Chain length 82, copies 4
């Protein structure tokens, strides 16, 4: 117990300047526990999809999720590998 | 009509499960725009991320059928 | 004995080319740490990116076999 | 007149190298169709994979600029030979 766990994060961003800048600044801050990042623009929809795999602790996934959800034009779904 | 979907699959590392997932994703390949496979050998599991552009019938059939494979969990999110 | 390698694969969309690439990569799945597939439908082609951690002879073997497949182009970059 | 290109980028974990690659890839975001980042912490390195659809000026600019960042190694491959 108390070990880091795997989590999957899917982020859907509206692909304007501000929204993308804030998501990027955040993920830079948390890059330590990010094991994988995939960014796929959906230009047809002016949106971008980002998939993340993290291996991290409770404090950290919670901090990241809370912060992403405070960014305008960003939806995030967080799930543990379990 | 078609819209974008994100599918996340978590597979337990069993020969049968991988085979069945692969067969399904093969049958549905025309709708898949991206596929990322990331093994988690530490946890005897794999993660698969997919992006599709397809309709309700198709995403419903694929998700439903993935979810019926022993050792597989699936989550589907419309892009919106 | 083991090192990281990156493989980029470009595959012309022929039923057989796809099948043989998949069959080959299945043989080497133990070594594969990441696989990303991105179809390019407007060119009838698909891109595969792979990261492997394996020995020199294994990455030599896989690269050699991939290169022999009609419609497949493969580039191998060691991480160092 | 725009063509598909694949880039593989290998970066060492330096504040400088990371930030230089990132600034550069920000400038070229319009034509990037996929970006995958995979760190390899065993080696203190990161791998970036890119697919772009872009013109001649732009892919030469990007690969040329990437090619001259210390701690970066880049390979650019056209989709069609």
């Amino acid at each position: 117990h108390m070990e880091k766990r795997f989590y999957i994060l899917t982020i859907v961003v509206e692909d304007r300047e501000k929204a993308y800048r804030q998501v990027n600044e955040l993920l830079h801050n948390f890059s330590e526990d990010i094991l994988l990042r995939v960014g796929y623009p959906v230009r047809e929809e002016n949106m971008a999809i980002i998939f993340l795999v993290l291996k991290t602790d409770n404090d950290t996934i919670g901090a990241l999720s809370g912060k992403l959800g405070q960014i305008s034009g960003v939806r995030v779904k967080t799930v543990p590998l379990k």
